[PDB]
């Protein structure tokens, strides 16, 4: 088997837990040997360890640079009573990002037989977003926002609003330079890693100081640190006003990175393609990545699975979490064998869908869900078997 | 002719001004007579009156309740050079909106043969936008605070925004008045009742629990005290959504709801700004100002001056009139004018659905680069065809 090296894996919850184990059993473990740092972030085990497993998983990603994560339940009030949780544990994803830093980039997987929301988008678009004290104003009065330098030599007082005719609400927000810089570095690394050009969108016409700082810091870091590496790959970096970016992006064919300063997984859910959207946290050092599906645990399918009904859950996004993590491991290690495997598994997935073997969501995307009949699609396990069979052929032929 | 009553009109600039006159002369005046209160907000008349004609027009709307407005040039540094005018006057639409107040609602015009960005959207969705931050650079370490000082001399309240311990960054403050939020709510309920469609408000009140929670609370309070009964009598409702759920729900919907949001760009990228209409809906439920959501279409106006054939879409400008006229008809219980407004909209939709369209519409079918001259009509050709179809429909209606 391929010697794969150090990968941090995080097990999860409900329907994605099922698919995750299938991915390891049928598509990864038959071909790759991993020095696997495996952490169980299932809700019950987070409860039993008082969420310590989540913090330990994040520490492992930092040490070993490659994380692949299965979808996890984020507790709310009803989860607390469903599992009798000791408390409403915080989102594992927030815990991990707070420890790793970095920027989340989402990317759709595109197949030629599958409609796109914007049909001219024939190459994927990779979108990353940059990730407040608010209060109630009880009645008339001035709200002001002040800055006091550490030396105390000055004191600038900006008027937010003079409320004259009632109360309302107000808020202050901020960003540290370092956070903007990290967002730049991650974005530049994303673009170099994929070999695609990079756009930053802001509303610097309106937030001239706040958003102009994003623009200035991106351009300064580009000029000092990345411009040669971009010109070596014949890619480029530009700023856009968000108004123009949206119009230009919709007239584009795709194949660019879009760093967005002001969600896309919500459009995917509305469109019915969450199972085809992957996600990757990109740390600004360019070394550490955490890959995962953009969707959740798919509870509604899992209740169906629990009741004996047939499930047609799309495993592609979860598969591409593995391939993206392994491809990155291959890049850090110059593992040609691994790189070939990771790429081959992505090709197999797209070839299989493009030959008409797909889950119910993809069939509904072609035909519309009302017109979908059961023979137009495979169920979760049929689809995985077909992918396993096509992966066996593809790897054997080389 | 049909008696129309009192309508405030605002003429405008460049390509829209030319479309504007073709509409009155071919589509409105042959069949309707109006107590028309006209105001010329063309850039020249706006300079030559120190932008006074603009605020007179806004007062006329306040008084007469119905305004219809052509698109107007907003001045920038290149505009002042163009007409050698005396100042970089403010947007006529900002002037108008702070005299009247109220919420801008946008609505696309749908035709069966013109593809939609979301195929399942067969009925229009109406988006209501609430519409000022103070932002600055933080140059180095220090404290950013935001404070509230009551106007009655009582104790100021201080909120820590951030201690910058190393380096600087940026900060800003934002605000919203209860009255603006209450007006937004009223305008939104009014708009949902006039159309007979349910209403959704979207916020992110899970993160900004005080700021956005204020919007959610004001909408709900006002809904219960003054609107729930009238809503339940048109089989519609009001509900609040987190923005994530609202985006998903909306894309799975069929359309036909009001979305109060706490859009133009997507229309421009999709190529459908010519099919996008707008209406300023004041909180009283009596005053509207209707207009195309697009601008003066400068780029086509230049082709018009250089003797080039143009194919600028007039539908959204026509619907400024029809929506203004429909609202004027509802105020006056004028059934004859309500019929004309509705019929001019249906004529417009049907003409397109029969294959007679301007070049942008043809491009939604064939693809932006793939239109040829035989696929569409030019601006004046299209107006004639509307005019002919409008005559035929009004003749066949007296039965
Ligand atoms: N990164 C993470 O760990 C995330 C975890 N979550 C967690 O997931 C749980 C459930 O969240 P929920 O709001 O239902 O969001 P999910 O994304 O889990 O599911 C939402 C809907 O999108 C469709 N969908 C999502 N994934 C697939 C797929 N792989 N194949 C086919 N269809 C798919 C299904 O729609 P349909 O019903 O129409 O088939 C599904 O019901 C929650 O506990 C939440 O905390 C949520 C987001 C991220
Ligand atoms: N409420 C108002 O009065 C508004 C006025 N304006 C003003 O209008 C002027 C021009 O602004 P601009 O940025 O060009 O915005 P416009 O909305 O006038 O035009 C933008 C582009 O969108 C397309 N488009 C818009 N309307 C139509 C239509 N009716 N038929 C066909 N295509 C259309 C055209 O694209 P293509 O180039 O592909 O043909 C046009 O070049 C400015 O002076 C601005 O201040 C702007 C917004 C609102
Ligand atoms: C609309 C989107 C959910 C999917 C479904 O259908 C498409 O055409 N989609 C495409 C097509 C290419 N590239 C993407 N990338 C993602 C990250 C994206 C999300 C949101 C906006 C832009 C871009 N999405
Ligand atoms: C995408 C949009 C520009 C037009 C063009 O294509 C459509 O199918 N569009 C539709 C279809 C129904 N309803 C709308 N309403 C507008 C106000 C809107 C704009 C933006 C978002 C939501 C809703 N737009």
From Swiss-Prot, chain A:
Residues with the N6-succinyllysine modification: 123, 386
Originating organism: Homo sapiens
Binding positions (Mn(2+)): 243, 265
Quaternary structure, from the entry: Homodimer.
Cofactor(s) needed: Mg(2+); Mn(2+)
Function, as annotated: Catalyzes the NADP(+)-dependent oxidative decarboxylation of isocitrate (D-threo-isocitrate) to 2-ketoglutarate (2-oxoglutarate), which is required by other enzymes such as the phytanoyl-CoA dioxygenase. Plays a critical role in the generation of NADPH, an important cofactor in many biosynthesis pathways. May act as a corneal epithelial crystallin and may be involved in maintaining corneal epithelial transparency.
Entry's EC annotation: 1.1.1.42
Catalytic activity: D-threo-isocitrate + NADP(+) = 2-oxoglutarate + CO2 + NADPH
Cofactor note: Binds 1 Mg(2+) or Mn(2+) ion per subunit.
Residue(s) carrying N6-acetyllysine: 78, 215, 224, 234, 307
Broad class of where this protein is predominantly found: cytoplasm
Name recorded for this polypeptide: Isocitrate dehydrogenase [NADP] cytoplasmic
Disorder: Glioma: Gliomas are benign or malignant central nervous system neoplasms derived from glial cells. They comprise astrocytomas and glioblastoma multiforme that are derived from astrocytes, oligodendrogliomas derived from oligodendrocytes and ependymomas derived from ependymocytes.
Residues the record marks as site: Critical for catalysis: 203
């Amino acid at each position: 088997k391929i010697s794969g090296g150090s990968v941090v894996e995080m097990q999860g919850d409900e329907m994605t837990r099922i698919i995750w184990e299938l991915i390891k059993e049928k598509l990864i473990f038959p071909y790759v040997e991993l020095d696997l740092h495996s952490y169980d972030l299932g809700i019950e085990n987070r409860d039993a360890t008082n969420d310590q497993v989540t913090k330990d998983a994040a520490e492992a990603i930092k040490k070993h640079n490659v994380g692949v994560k299965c979808a996890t339940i984020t507790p709310d009030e009803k989860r607390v009573e469903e599992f009798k949780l000791k408390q409403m544990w915080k989102s594992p994803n927030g815990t991990i990002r707070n420890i790793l830093g970095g920027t989340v980039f989402r990317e759709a997987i595109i197949c030629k037989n599958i409609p796109r929301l914007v049909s001219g988008w024939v190459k994927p678009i990779i979108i990353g977003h940059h990730a407040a004290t608010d209060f109630v104003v009880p009645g008339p009065g001035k709200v002001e926002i002040t800055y006091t330098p550490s030396d105390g030599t000055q004191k600038v007082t900006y008027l937010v609003h003079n409320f004259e005719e009632g109360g309302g609400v107000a808020m202050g927000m901020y960003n540290q330079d370092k956070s903007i810089e990290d967002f730049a570095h991650s974005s530049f690394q994303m673009a170099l890693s994929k070999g695609w050009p990079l756009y930053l969108s802001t509303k610097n016409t309106i937030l001239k100081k706040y958003d102009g700082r994003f623009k200035d810091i991106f351009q300064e870091i580009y000029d000092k640190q990345y411009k040669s590496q971009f010109e070596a790959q014949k890619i480029w970096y530009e700023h856009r006003l968000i108004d123009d970016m949206v119009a230009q992006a919709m007239k584009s064919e795709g194949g660019f990175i879009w760093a967005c300063k002001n969600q896309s997984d919500s459009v995917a859910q509305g469109y019915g393609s969450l199972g085809m959207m992957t996600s990757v946290l990109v740390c600004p050092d360019g070394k550490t990545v955490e890959a995962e599906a953009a969707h959740g645990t798919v509870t509604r399918h899992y209740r169906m699975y629990q009741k004996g009904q047939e499930t047609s859950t799309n495993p592609i996004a979860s598969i591409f979490a593995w391939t993206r993590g392994l491809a990155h491991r291959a890049k850090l290690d110059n593992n040609k064998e691994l790189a070939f495997f990771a790429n081959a598994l992505e090709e197999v997935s797209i070839e299989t869908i493009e030959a008409g073997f797909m889950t119910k969501d993809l069939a509904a995307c072609i035909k519309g869900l009302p017109n979908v009949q059961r023979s137009d699609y495979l169920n979760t396990f049929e689809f995985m078997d077909k992918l396993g069979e096509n992966l066996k052929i593809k790897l054997a032929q080389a």
